[PDB]
Amino acid sequence: TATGVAITGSAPAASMDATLPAQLPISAASVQSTFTLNLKEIEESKEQVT
Amino acid sequence: TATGVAITGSAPAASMDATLPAQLPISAASVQSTFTLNLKEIEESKEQVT
């Protein structure tokens, strides 16, 4: 703060600024897919499909 | 699909994209026309018409 007093006045109060902490977590969930195909399915897929 | 799971968790369920057929038949109908001209008509209109 910056207050106005007289010349013969005493003093203002303390008035120091502040900075605050800010934080965002990165330890939570992932994003996953799991498609999981076989071996017999992918063997006749070489000859059945155009 | 792609969902959210924790890192010390498990693996999500299966997912895979799909294809579909369309099949558009061409077997049934046909566009036609006829003439029906005589054999005297195609002779007396060869010595007359200009």
Contact call for B2 and A33, based on CB within 8 A:
yes
Q: Which residues of A touch B (CB under 8 A)?
A: 27-37
Closest residue, chain A, to B4 (C-alpha): A31
Return the ∠ at Cα B4 (arms to B2 and B10), rounded to 5°.
100
d(CA A33, CA B14): 7
Output DSSP code: residue A31: E
The resolution in angstroms reads 3.5
Alpha-carbon gap, residue B18 to B30, rounded angstroms? 35
How close A27 gets to chain B, by Cα (Å)? 8
In 3D space, the residue among A37, A18, A32 whose CA is nearest the CA of residue B5 turns out to be A32
Partners of A31 in beta bridges: B4
